[PDB]
Amino acid sequence: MEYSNPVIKGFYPDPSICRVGSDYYLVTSSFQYFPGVPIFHSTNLINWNKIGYCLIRPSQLMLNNATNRSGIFAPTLRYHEGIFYLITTNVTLKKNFIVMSEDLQGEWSEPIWIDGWGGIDPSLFFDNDGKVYITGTNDNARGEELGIYQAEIDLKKGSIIGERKLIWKGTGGSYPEAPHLYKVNGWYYLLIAEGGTEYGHMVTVARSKYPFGPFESCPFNPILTHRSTNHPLQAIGHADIVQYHDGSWWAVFHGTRPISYPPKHHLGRETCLAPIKWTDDGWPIIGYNGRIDIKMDAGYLPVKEIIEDDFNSDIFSTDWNFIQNPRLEHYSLKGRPSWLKMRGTEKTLNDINSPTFIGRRQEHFVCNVSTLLEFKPNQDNEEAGLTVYMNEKHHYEIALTKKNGRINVVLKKTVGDIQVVVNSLEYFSNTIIFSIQANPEEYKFSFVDPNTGQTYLLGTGLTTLLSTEVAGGFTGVYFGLYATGNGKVCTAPAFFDWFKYIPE
Template sequence: MATFKNPVIPGFHPDPSVCRVGEDYYLVTSSFDYFPGIPIFHSRDLVNWRQLGHVLTRESQLPLKGQLPAGWSQGIYAPTIRHHDGRFYVITTNISIQKSFYVWSERPEGPWSEPIFLEGWGGVDPSLLFDEDGKTYLTGTTNFYGEPVGIYQAELDIESGKLLSERRLIWEGTGGSHPEGPHLYRINGWYYLMVAEGGTEYGHMETIARSRSAYGPFESNPANPILSNRSTPKPIQATGHADLVQAADGSWWCVFLGIRPVANAKRHILGRETNLAPVSWNEEGWPAVGNHGIAELEHDAGNLPLGEPVEWGIRDEFHSDKLHSVWNFYRNPVPESWSLKERTGWLTLRGQACTLNDKESPAFIGRRQQHKNIQVETLLDFQPSVDGEEAGLAVFMNEKFHYEIAKTRKDGKSKLLLRRRIGSIVQVTAETDYDEPMVILGIQANEVLYTLTYAAPGKEPVVLGQGETAFLSKEVAGGFTGVYFAMYATGNGKNAVTPAYFDYFDYLPMEDKPMDFFTIMSLS
């Protein structure tokens, strides 16, 4: 029996949505504060996903300059991908500007169109159904203006983005909090409405209802929820925000988000990840996901034509004139803050006045932490000429929760420092003189600790300090993202004069060896 393991896309890849075109599958996830926005993946087996790039690659498609309250993530929430009449459509909400929109392309790798904004909509988590009769239904959640909580729907003119009917409340869910992430399907003459409830935390669940009419009334599945790992000891928790897809062989599958907490600590650092499970249908025509509604770490692959596993570890030596698809900026980058051409084979960062502590866009290029046990390394060539200039390697959750090891200049001397920011507490916990122009900066992570190191080229690494993973967990830091490893530079209040050059970046996943509860408690 062939099996596969979850998550199928590890690390911060929440709110997955999937569609099939022939024997090819395409999947998108939320990207929140990061740019480019909406990573898009391709698979031939639903298990092994390779990133094609991003849907939103231009600032005109994804402005990220909004200022939301502390603890919120900005940017892109809950995209849906669908294919119709030769076009791919991705519909979503940019919470920074509080507008929903869609883009389209004839090729999944793009380029994608400019946004078509939904006139008169106002809700979040929008989804599309291209019905058999030629109508297009827009389904989403409560708007920004205080209307009753529930799932709303209208008919949409897909060419213009205008509503062809009034917004109508079609279902309030089963009573769980925050009914959201709806998808409407037409299957065997029924309209099925699938919804996430319970909040995207440990009470998360997926429920479903059906009707003979697109607008209901909707009959709730008597066996709801069809997916939830709440109140179980399963290693995957907070399962929900799902999307259904029928495979080429006729079988049904479900992609959904979930988290992998650290042992029994009920905290997680990798963010909400993309998982997969089979879907079974009972004699009454109701679906159940996974093992009778439970998502497992390992599931039977059925007849899926399993291909070669994806290699998540990479060494990027920056020889291309384009960034690899794993990289993101934090919000919209300042164009002159980075370059792959200024020094051939190196990534150049030019520090801006803003720092990692600010709700702006620092000189920052990072990638998701996708594994609990991991080694990261980069070679930095940086000779700061002005006090306060700084460049280094960060473990970054958001502007209020991050650790960094960096080279800087202080009182005319070149130094290495380790800084930790935990909420309102900012402290340089270690500092040492360092006169060499080049330094190898490293991070080793396990479930409990980040260990930050430095080394002169050809020398053994030296530990400069550590930081607990717990303080960068979503449960402490808030928001909806996961941890990033990032190369960064800053002038600490003014634009830096000296560029920082990064020669390579290694991301090396280690063998997954989960710690037991007592080991974690002894190290915490």
């Protein structure tokens, strides 16, 4: 039996996994998007269902001034004696913290801030003797030696017990990070990432008889990498290990699916799965001797996407994210029941600090995305539409607006410093359907006059100008609904009737 990588497609980086009984839970990083830290459930490690998010209240998730280069970095999920612990860094705050839950169907606790614990990629390990360890990276603010640092932790207080110790510098790759500590068959294993989360990414491992070392580097490090290969999966690493309930061992990790030359990726880093074998001499081997594939052998794992939101519910679906903390008063499912009402502010998609926007990840190279908008702009600056969005300097949008007192449909692009109106046509109806067809190379932007059903191709745009390599940051493309007054508050409401996401 076979499965395909990635197992969670689209922008789902830094996967951390946690087993409870015969069920599995997984979390990913979310940067500037709100709510933060998607959480998934699976029974077979292959098929994952999003249960919701971990950070859903402003007290848990302060994203003022966050961008796709900041906000929430790698989260780690652990379970002990009926309690889930989620530990992560808000890089904008420069703070590490824990939230807790006894029930993933309910909400998580207020943050327990870990004072004086710096760096990114905090992790927790519950040792068999009852001791709890926090492991993490060098603190940049301080200017510490690159490497992996560890201490005992008191979980109630969120405070370190005893001394913080450097435990391993790694094999010598850049950015030693993503540390997780495990104990298997009497050995402590320290699993890390090196090389940076781009084309040099790799997984390395060390072991010791003691939780604080000394750690011996695995003689066949790195144990997983696609560096220096032209494989369709690239930038592989940031791994977390699980033992399935049949006793077999597996790792989750992220990778990219770049296209073009030099390689460029626009779907973000995506969650992948590979089996682990243990050597006779007590080392883990990931995948096919340190390499993985798109099609993989499922071993004994039990093998087994059209999304349509008509805005009938007064609760937002779990597909939606906002750019930073939403200004709640600017979105309404109740103002006009069965529609989403959005109120544009002075902020545009070129601005980092909460523009009026709600969006969902692009999770497929080939898909069709559409929405119906009612919008009657009162003034020339006023605009609402559908965006393909990577960050504040890299986005395309098809929108209704006004120019010299005439309503126009426009295709607009921001790429770096370039802000261009690509095409503009007069439009004569109160509602419009926007439709975007995505393929690996380009987006095609069309609009439909709803009453006639007549379709019009407005223009196209390249996927590669939205790629991470071009745009910067750590994220993937989103499709979003937005409104703006382009420097002034928008005086006209935007009403979106529905949103459809149809993969090939």
